[PDB]
Design a protein around this ligand. Structure first.
Ligand SMILES: *C[C@@](*)(O)[C@H](CCCNC(N)=[NH2+])NC(=O)[C@@H]1CCCN1C(=O)[C@H](N)Cc1ccccc1
Ligand SMILES: [K+]
Ligand code: NA
Lengths: 27, 252
DNA sequence: GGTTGGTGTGGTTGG
């Protein structure tokens, strides 16, 4: 289904305050 | 959660609060994995050394919450449990091996901007995301410091996964493949941990491939909270997925 | 207060 996609974030193309820190850790 | 910050509204819509009916008491966190199933840590339900053995009628879950103690009228939803399933090989005698339980809700919960399931990983997602140095995210309403302090809203902290030899050397408790550890090393110059009261809450990771949040871990145990040279331990969700799938398939 | 703080021409929501 749409598991793991947040109505107030991914669904509105908004990022939360600290998810980029997670994205950066893969780099 | 130690050294975290207040969650944003809707930041963790799979977050679940496990509540004892009476006395009324916050027991643990938990996470929503579908409209009918909630995952948590086994020791939140069954821990004989602390005289703890809850069945369905002892408990309720609260979903969609942000405030720790205020009833959030028109936002949060309360669910009774039809049935609890504890992993049959859950080892409470020794090291909390297989620290995992499922709780089936009596009725599906309606989803909202505040209430939405997290994904469980498949083998590929687990292989690619669960590596040392990659960061995930832990949420909860548990203690803000070791006691030896309760937050007013849901707390969040991001923490790196730790190499297994480092996890194993940090503790004399026997670590198994059903666990992983996360947290900064003493001289990494950042801090943060789960703490008592955070058990059952999710360690989640956002996939850079499809932009979804996956629950890789369950807050399980530690020694103190946020100590230098200690790490928080988490139930390894993907490692126990055959059991999760077995319970959902047979009992839904 | 209330299944609930401390303030709302509410809020993550009425009166
Ligand atoms: C029940 C959960 O709230 C709690 C989570 C602790 C997380 N700690 C950190 N620093 N991330 N788990 C517990 O309190 C578990 C339940 C039984 C006791 N326990 C411990 O964490 C002890 N501190 C250590 C332990 C004792 C026996 C078996 C395994 C670990
Ligand atoms: K009010
Ligand atoms: Na630490």
């Amino acid at each position: 289904a749409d598991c793991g996609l947040r109505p107030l974030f991914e669904k509105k193309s908004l990022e939360d305050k600290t998810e980029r820190e997670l994205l950066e850790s893969y780099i | 959660i130690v050294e975290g910050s207040d969650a944003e509204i809707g930041m963790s819509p799979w977050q679940v609060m496990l509540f004892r009916k009476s006395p009324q008491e916050l027991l643990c966190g938990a996470s929503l994995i579908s409209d009918r199933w909630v995952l948590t840590a086994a020791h939140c339900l069954l821990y004989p050394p602390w005289d703890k053995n809850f069945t369905e009628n002892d408990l309720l879950v609260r979903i969609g919450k942000h405030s720790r103690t205020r009833y959030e009228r028109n936002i949060e939803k309360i669910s009774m449990l039809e049935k609890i399933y504890i992993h049959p090989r859950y080892n409470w005698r020794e090291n909390l091996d297989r620290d995992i339980a499922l709780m089936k809700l009596k009725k599906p919960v309606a989803f909202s901007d505040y209430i939405h399931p997290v994904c469980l990983p498949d083998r590929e997602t687990a292989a690619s995301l669960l590596q040392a140095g990659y960061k995930g995210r832990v949420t909860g309403w548990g203690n803000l410091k070791e006691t030896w302090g309760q937050p007013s809203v849901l707390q969040v902290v991001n923490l790196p996964i730790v190499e297994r030899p480092v996890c194993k050397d940090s503790t004399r408790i026997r670590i198994t493949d059903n666990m992983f550890c996360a947290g900064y090393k003493p001289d990494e110059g950042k801090r943060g941990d789960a703490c008592e009261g955070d058990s059952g809450g999710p360690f989640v990771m956002k996939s850079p491939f499809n932009n979804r949040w996956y629950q890789m871990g369950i807050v399980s145990w530690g020694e103190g909270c946020d100590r230098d040279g200690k790490y928080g331990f988490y139930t390894h969700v993907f490692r126990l997925k055959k059991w999760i799938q077995k319970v959902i398939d047979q009992f839904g």
